[PDB]
C-alpha cells in the first residue's frame, strides 16, 4: 500500500503539449507558444545574405 500527493509547488515544473479536451489527439495551437518560438530563434547561426 502506498500514496503520494504534490507539495512544495516551487519544486516541480512540467512542460506539456496542447491536447484536445475530449480526446488525446493533438489539435490545439498551444498557449505558451509565442513566449516560445522567440526563445527558439536565439539558438541559431546568423547569416547576412548578399
Amino acid at each position: 500500500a502506498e500514496g503520494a500527493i504534490p507539495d512544495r509547488w516551487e519544486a516541480v515544473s512540467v512542460v506539456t503539449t496542447a491536447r484536445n479536451a475530449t480526446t488525446g489527439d493533438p489539435d490545439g495551437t498551444g498557449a505558451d507558444d509565442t513566449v516560445v518560438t522567440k526563445r527558439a530563434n536565439r539558438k541559431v547561426i546568423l547569416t547576412k545574405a548578399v
Partner: peptide
Amino acid sequence: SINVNITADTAETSPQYLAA
C-alpha cells in the same frame, strides 16, 4: 509551479523547440 504549454506538431519536428 510553472507549466509550459507548447504546440505538439512543432515539438515533434524540431529539437530546438524543446530545448527552448
